[PDB]
Design an enzyme around this catalytic site. Sequence first.
Site, PDB file in Angstrom:
ATOM      1  N   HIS A 127      24.081  55.601  30.936  1.00 38.87           N
ATOM      2  CA  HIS A 127      22.790  55.143  30.271  1.00 38.87           C
ATOM      3  C   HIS A 127      22.501  56.221  28.896  1.00 38.87           C
ATOM      4  CE1 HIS A 127      18.235  54.594  29.879  1.00 38.87           C
ATOM      5  NE2 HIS A 127      18.799  53.355  29.995  1.00 38.87           N
TER       6      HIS A 127
ATOM      7  N   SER B  18      27.997  51.813  26.438  1.00 37.98           N
ATOM      8  CA  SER B  18      29.413  51.581  26.532  1.00 37.98           C
ATOM      9  C   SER B  18      30.339  51.530  25.224  1.00 37.98           C
ATOM     10  CB  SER B  18      29.343  50.101  27.008  1.00 37.98           C
ATOM     11  OG  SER B  18      29.020  49.925  28.368  1.00 37.98           O
TER      12      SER B  18
ATOM     13  N   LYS C 231      26.641  35.728  31.114  1.00 35.67           N
ATOM     14  CA  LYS C 231      28.255  36.035  31.099  1.00 35.67           C
ATOM     15  C   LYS C 231      28.719  36.705  32.621  1.00 35.67           C
ATOM     16  CE  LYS C 231      31.712  37.642  28.187  1.00 35.67           C
ATOM     17  NZ  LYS C 231      32.136  38.557  26.978  1.00 35.67           N
ATOM     18  N   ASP C 232      27.783  37.367  33.347  1.00 35.95           N
ATOM     19  CA  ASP C 232      27.994  38.115  34.341  1.00 35.95           C
ATOM     20  C   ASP C 232      28.208  36.910  35.521  1.00 35.95           C
ATOM     21  OD1 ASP C 232      28.815  40.812  34.170  1.00 35.95           O
ATOM     22  OD2 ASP C 232      26.746  41.161  33.969  1.00 35.95           O
TER      23      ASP C 232
ATOM     24  N   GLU D 147      48.797  49.554  54.099  1.00 33.47           N
ATOM     25  CA  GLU D 147      48.226  48.425  53.227  1.00 33.47           C
ATOM     26  C   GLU D 147      48.800  48.703  51.926  1.00 33.47           C
ATOM     27  OE1 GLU D 147      46.830  46.153  56.056  1.00 33.47           O
ATOM     28  OE2 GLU D 147      45.762  45.861  54.170  1.00 33.47           O
TER      29      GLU D 147
END
Lengths: 126, 126, 385, 385, 62, 51, 49, 54
Positions: D202, D206, D228-229, D272
Amino acid sequence: PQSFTSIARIGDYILKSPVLSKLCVPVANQFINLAGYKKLGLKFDDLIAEENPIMQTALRRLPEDESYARAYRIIRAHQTELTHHLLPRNEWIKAQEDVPYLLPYILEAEAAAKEKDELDNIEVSK
Amino acid sequence: PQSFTSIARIGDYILKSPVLSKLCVPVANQFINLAGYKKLGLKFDDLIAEENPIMQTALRRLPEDESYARAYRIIRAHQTELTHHLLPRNEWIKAQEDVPYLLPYILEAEAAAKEKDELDNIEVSK
Amino acid sequence: MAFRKSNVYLSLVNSYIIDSPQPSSINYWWNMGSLLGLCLVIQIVTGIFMAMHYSSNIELAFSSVEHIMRDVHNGYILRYLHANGASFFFMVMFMHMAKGLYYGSYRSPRVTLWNVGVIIFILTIATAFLGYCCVYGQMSHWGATVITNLFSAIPFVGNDIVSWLWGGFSVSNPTIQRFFALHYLVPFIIAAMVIMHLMALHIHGSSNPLGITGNLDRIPMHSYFIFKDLVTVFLFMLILALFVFYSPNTLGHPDNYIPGNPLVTPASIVPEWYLLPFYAILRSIPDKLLGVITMFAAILVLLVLPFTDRSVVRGNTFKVLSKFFFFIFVFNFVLLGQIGACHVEVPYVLMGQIATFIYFAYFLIIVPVISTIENVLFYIGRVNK
Amino acid sequence: MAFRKSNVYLSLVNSYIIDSPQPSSINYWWNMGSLLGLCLVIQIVTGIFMAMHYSSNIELAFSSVEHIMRDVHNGYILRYLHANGASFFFMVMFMHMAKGLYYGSYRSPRVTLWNVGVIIFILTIATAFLGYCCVYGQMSHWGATVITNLFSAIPFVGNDIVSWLWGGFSVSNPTIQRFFALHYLVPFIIAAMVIMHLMALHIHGSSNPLGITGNLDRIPMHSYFIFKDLVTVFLFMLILALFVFYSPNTLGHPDNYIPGNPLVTPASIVPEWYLLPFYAILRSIPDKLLGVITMFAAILVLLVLPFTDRSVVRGNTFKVLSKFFFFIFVFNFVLLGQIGACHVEVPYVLMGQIATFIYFAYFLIIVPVISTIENVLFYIGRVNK
Amino acid sequence: KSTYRTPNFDDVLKENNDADKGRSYAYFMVGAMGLLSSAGAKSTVETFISSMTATADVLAMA
Amino acid sequence: TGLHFGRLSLRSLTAYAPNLMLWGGASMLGLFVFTEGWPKFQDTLYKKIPL
Amino acid sequence: PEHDERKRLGLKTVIILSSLYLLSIWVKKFKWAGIKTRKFVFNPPKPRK
Amino acid sequence: SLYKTFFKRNAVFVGTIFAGAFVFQTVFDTAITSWYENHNKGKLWKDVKARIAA
Ligand SMILES: CCCCCCCCCCC(=O)OC[C@H](COP(=O)(O)OC[C@H](O)COP(=O)(O)OC[C@@H](COC(=O)CC)OC(=O)CCC)OC(=O)CCCCCCCC
Ligand SMILES: CCCCCCCCCCC(=O)OC[C@H](COP(=O)(O)OC[C@H](O)COP(=O)(O)OC[C@@H](COC(=O)CC)OC(=O)CCC)OC(=O)CCCCCCCC
Ligand SMILES: CCCCCCCCCCCCCCCCCC(=O)OC[C@H](COP(=O)(O)OCCN)OC(=O)CCCCCCCCCCCCC
Ligand SMILES: CCCCCCCCCCCCCCCCCC(=O)OC[C@H](COP(=O)(O)OCCN)OC(=O)CCCCCCCCCCCCC
Ligand code: HEM
Ligand code: HEM
Ligand code: HEM
Ligand code: HEM
Ligand SMILES: COc1c(O)c(C)c(C/C=C(/C)CC/C=C(\C)CC/C=C(/C)CC/C=C(/C)CC/C=C(\C)CCC=C(C)C)c(O)c1OC
Ligand SMILES: COc1c(O)c(C)c(C/C=C(\C)CC/C=C(\C)CC/C=C(\C)CC/C=C(\C)CC/C=C(\C)CCC=C(C)C)c(O)c1OC
Ligand SMILES: CCCCCCCCCCCCCCCCCC(=O)O[C@H](COC(=O)CCCCCC)COP(=O)(O)OCCN
Ligand SMILES: CCCCCCCCCCCCCCCCCC(=O)O[C@H](COC(=O)CCCCCC)COP(=O)(O)OCCN
Ligand SMILES: CO/C=C(/C(=O)OC)c1ccccc1Oc1cc(Oc2ccccc2C#N)ncn1
Ligand SMILES: CO/C=C(/C(=O)OC)c1ccccc1Oc1cc(Oc2ccccc2C#N)ncn1
């Protein structure tokens, strides 16, 4: 991270050598054309990361007619990127327009910060 | 929560009655002396909670010589409280000094807010 | 600026416990909130280390706790600090809420802070109920039988909420296994509510025992209230150590050292001491549906206090009638806890019904009437008319 | 102002997912962070409902999971969504970290954001290791035997860290009971690190795929990146549903349906798929103490990248040499996972030793040399001298 | 050139705007998404809630 | 000549008279859909003529 | 033993989740069309200010 | 007009997507189960019990 004073010291040594400027300079022209920033309408000095005190000093001292033109090229490149297209071919940056307009302001601010650092951690002798 | 317009309406009805002012007024004088705010150097209008828009309006309109004296009485009462003491007896508030200095500013701001609320939710007739 | 103000994670620390402005006149009653933070850490840390040795099957649950007391190195210290630490958690929480009633901390602009605290009190009661089931003693089995059977009186959905809570037809093996898994989770929900509780407190700050504004004289938190907090931390730990090492079974019931038997009923079914007043309120209503509604209304009636207090003064410091009826309410709460530990006999049945009425009449009748009278006595004792 | 900006709890919601300014040119690679938040909720919620039916004793652990698959209503849905959901959690996390390497998200001023993410990656690896032990299959017992025996090679403290981790002399009943209690706790520590991760994000916002400043053209989060998410949320759920209902045992090992036997060794001990590259790095060092140090250095070497990248440009979009060596590093990681599932045989032993060298030489040799050369080629291709 | 001249938008514009048809088709697709998301979220909660009812071995001893 | 009082209005509720018939009916449709498959809610909701 | 029931429940889940995926692509492309067709024009300002 | 009779009044735009989803559950589950059992006819237990009656 690597300073522009160090980049210019290595680069001017190659360009003065007549044998090294025949080998590296054709490779550098193919490297820039494969990079592709000119097809989005950008110059190279638009791509420099700016979140540091040296670059904030150099961007303040830029003349305002060049600061308005830099802001339009960055905005036009973001809009072209989100449409997943390129610019029309008559709007590409030519090689004679891809000049280092910001480089003399960066080198002047770097030399002043180096002289201040040498005077702040200094010896004397009688 | 209960408005000062409602408190003054009930209280002035008792004080005009000659039979109700003989019963309740001796009880109210014992209630104030047992409260003990005058032994810390406070008047009653210093004790009113101020975190509401009506009280913030009335505190702005107070004359500045009375606003400086109110601030000194509140600060002196906090310092006496943390030492777990009382003031000297010659520094107590007397009954003829315990006057409602803030009450006319409060009642004027309450009447203006009531008239605004009646004009905002109003009927008409032809 | 300094690094404690410029860093993203240290500025939250600096604005809460270092540089936060406190009123200069708060007394030792304002130290109970930081003791509750220490109690929650103690209950969580002793909880994880005991859970490494615990089995939640109904054939193995009682012997797992006896395995902790006998075979685990310092295992008796972990259990006794955990069981006695739950009683100390409720005692500090009762004094913290009674400080808020006395000084008017519930009033505006601190209504959101008071409402989040009521949610915390509900989640703490549910936590202590689920941990008591995990012992599977004789008081554990029959206390869970009585409380879960209350929900079958709800209309049209009641007989299917109970069997969804049992996982079967009675208190059995799926009940104990799901109660231990819920007991692990709810203290982490409590820790998230405490963070939301501290955010609302940072907005307005604390009140003070005089009831008036504190903006004129503030002192910072560090080295004044840090060292005042150390006095009550060491006194709390000393009294808790006297119970853990010298009298560890005084605050419990000896029937919980008998393993749970669904065929033998104990002679008396008694909760822990901190749930005894709510148990006596439930037994005072003869109808079963109205009794469980009144039991949950005794917690939710704390939310009406910002609307029923009519006074123009915050707190009880200068009010002699509100002082008298506050202590009537305190000793009524102690009497309701004592009635909840007695048999259903004459005259304890009528005494519990009168004390239940006095509990609800304080919030809804006594507080709005007395605070209206005290508004008028302050006026006519000063105004010359 | 509006109520979403004035309320104390809604302004945190409004400044994060409603009004937060995003760069207008981010692509679908920037959606992986919100898918990781959905995966953590799915793993926590299916974890609580299975824990209501689970027993952690070593005589009862394998049959408890078979009891969930057969007797619990929709119990096979809870297990298969949980086991396959852990593999989807690691795949989205690998793509999220590889996006950060490609676009230079680790660089200043986002170093604190990158460092908190490395802590999250370590805690997720430890979580998946502890949940695999709780099955107590044949791969569960011998995989815990191999990893816990590595710590006895530490000088002067090694033989006492291992028996403190076992609670005894081998992998036995106190080991499984303490591993289930730790498995409950660490996802709540992960959730607190995610909150600290979102606070640092925050502050700066980004980055964008061009590598340059985004302050000139921003659009708000609500109804553009919310919708879009939704495209990648529904595609994620569809592919996860195809694995849960139609091929639920493809991403597992059939030896884990045999109960754990400490007297019979399996023919092959394989982890795994998402832990296979770190298993091949460990088997490539012949000395036992240097092998466990190199295994933990493969995660901690992610912290040197803010100091070894020497470029004046953020990201790989306009660099052809950095593009080539990024994909060399990606296919080297896939080859190391394939070597970790093979036997110790010629020529897989030498192939794993060369691929281990290429992994560490990318962070410490290749990135500082290539980014220095690309600084000089940009200069001399423009400057007339 | 002059800022009063609007650039060419003709390769994306509809031949007839007709505001009661463009709104009607967009609200059909948003309404169908809220219809299927509510039916999907309802069955999801009922799958988790019904796992707390009595198991098959408990019902066999009824 | 004047309307109602106290931070609400009968004028605000004489337009919002017949639509909490449907905003209450919005969550009459809430526990409509959210309650299905229960053994509780089928002597009034599965008795209908279709399906 | 759950094999016949698991494949019947999986058919309802895949059909519902496929429809929500195709509808979200239409809704995202409708709500983004104003940004995707946006145009910019630069006129250099007059000096001396 | 059919926007304002179906999607304007958002006291039932929340409502109709909450009530159309109730009748959606029973019609969808009846249609798939009938298709799934007809695709596997002759293999179910009810097709076996009809001629292991002997
Ligand atoms: C489960 C149990 C856990 C126990 C852990 C500790 C919890 C303690 C709980 C008791 C409590 O809450 O005490 C609060 C109450 C405060 O209420 P109050 O406003 O009447 O008195 C201001 C302050 O005390 C003055 O105390 P004072 O300030 O005068 O003490 C002098 C000194 C501090 O001395 C001490 O450290 C002794 C402890 O401070 C100085 O002034 C010198 C600095 C230069 O203290 C009082 O003095 C009032 C007495 C009534 C206590 C009865 C408790 C009924 C349950
Ligand atoms: C594992 C379980 C998780 C499931 C969900 C995770 C999804 C991960 C996919 C990787 C990723 O996130 O990046 C995707 C990236 C494309 O990014 P971009 O913004 O440049 O493309 C915008 C587009 O032009 C318009 O896309 P538009 O928005 O117009 O339509 C949406 C499109 C589907 O979009 C998506 O599903 C995104 C994943 O709908 C249609 O195709 C219409 C026909 C049905 O793709 C690339 O850059 C290269 C393509 C191959 C990548 C595969 C590598 C995987 C290791
Ligand atoms: C869901 C509903 C929950 C209900 C919560 C109610 C819980 C009640 C349980 C007992 C709580 C203990 C009450 C403690 C009283 C706290 C009140 C307070 O904060 O301070 C009030 C008073 C202040 O006195 P001053 O310092 O202001 O005096 C200066 C001169 N004016 O300070 C004093 O005068 C202290 C006097 C000592 C009080 C003695 C109380 C006795 C309590 C018996 C406990 C019995 C337990 C077995
Ligand atoms: C310690 C932890 C280590 C972590 C290492 C992680 C390794 C796991 C492998 C994850 C694969 C993810 C690779 C892609 C990462 C995304 C970032 C990226 O590469 O950018 C996308 C790239 C750029 O495309 P553009 O040039 O169009 O965009 C430029 C910006 N304007 O566009 C592309 O080129 C996308 C092509 C992607 C192909 C990659 C194939 C990967 C195959 C892996 C299979 C693994 C299972 C077998
Ligand atoms: C606010 C936090 C907590 C409270 C109030 C609380 C309360 C209680 C109580 C009252 C008991 C019954 C004790 C007895 O009389 O013997 C108990 C038992 C138990 N609790 Fe807690 N608990 C808390 C947190 C936790 C946590 C977080 C865990 C596990 C991670 C835990 C694990 C246990 C265990 C294993 C027992 C059974 C052993 C015993 O009887 O002491 N507790 N708890
Ligand atoms: C685990 C539980 C709790 C913790 C950790 C906690 C913590 C705190 C702290 C540290 C303070 C500030 C210092 C103080 O005034 O003591 C505070 C204040 C306050 N708390 Fe709590 N609390 C808890 C539970 C509760 C409960 C149950 C209530 C009420 C029902 C409540 C209501 C309040 C109020 C009203 C204040 C403001 C007091 C004032 O400003 O005078 N809290 N809390
Ligand atoms: C980030 C979160 C989590 C991850 C990555 C994770 C991972 C795993 C893995 C890989 C397994 C082995 C599954 C198998 O192959 O059968 C497992 C098992 C298990 N986990 Fe988790 N888990 C997480 C959270 C939780 C939580 C929070 C709980 C409990 C409250 C939990 C309870 C269980 C149980 C009971 C098992 C055994 C049943 C089974 O085998 O499925 N898990 N976990
Ligand atoms: C449970 C784990 C995680 C969650 C929930 C999470 C969440 C997020 C979110 C929501 C974002 C913003 C949107 C985006 O860029 O995708 C973000 C950004 C970022 N994350 Fe994570 N993350 C996790 C793990 C990690 C890890 C393991 C790393 C690296 C080792 C990491 C490093 C970063 C970085 C560098 C960014 C900034 C990217 C940029 O601005 O371009 N995160 N994270
Ligand atoms: C009025 O002004 C004040 C004020 O006066 C005070 C005192 C405080 C401080 C008082 C507090 C109570 C704050 C501190 C809060 C807490 C202590 C709550 C605890 C929070 C949690 C999230 C609990 C979780 C903590 C743990 C330690 C759990 C983790 C357990 C572990 C790691 C052990 C398991 C490990 C192994 C190996 C088994 C204020 O915040 C404040 O506001 C500004
Ligand atoms: C850059 O701009 C962005 C941005 O791009 C994005 C994507 C986000 C996205 C935000 C997120 C993805 C949020 C991150 C996700 C989390 C923090 C999840 C945390 C996990 C939990 C809180 C788990 C809690 C789960 C429970 C409590 C369930 C418990 C189970 C129970 C109670 C069972 C019920 C019991 C019974 C008896 C019925 C931003 O916030 C943001 O702004 C900064
Ligand atoms: C909302 C409630 C939850 C919030 C909890 C807040 C409290 C968190 C713990 C606070 C303890 C302080 C941690 C150390 C602070 C120093 C961090 C630092 O130096 O910042 C970084 C170093 O990066 C890191 O490695 C951070 C590791 C975090 C480890 C935490 C587990 C450098 O400092 P920087 O120059 O970036 O400071 C400016 C910040 N805007
Ligand atoms: C541990 C991590 C913590 C992360 C915190 C994230 C925030 C989560 C909150 C999520 C949204 C919650 C919506 C809250 C609703 C609005 C708040 C409110 O109503 O406050 C009050 C009423 O008080 C309450 O009843 C609080 C309800 C308790 C909520 C507990 C969940 C609204 O009235 P007020 O006018 O005071 O609002 C302005 C505040 N500045
Ligand atoms: C499992 O038995 C738990 C008991 C206990 O005291 O836990 C700490 C208990 C023992 C015997 C009898 C009853 C017991 O439980 C309870 C539970 C209880 O719960 C409430 C408290 C306040 C408001 C509502 C409820 C309820 N339900 N109120 C009183 N006793
Ligand atoms: C309990 O066995 C767990 C296993 C597993 O895969 O869990 C998901 C496992 C099975 C067989 C063999 C090994 C197994 O565990 C592991 C554990 C492991 O842990 C690390 C990963 C990265 C860095 C360091 C370590 C360690 N230690 N790296 C590789 N395999």
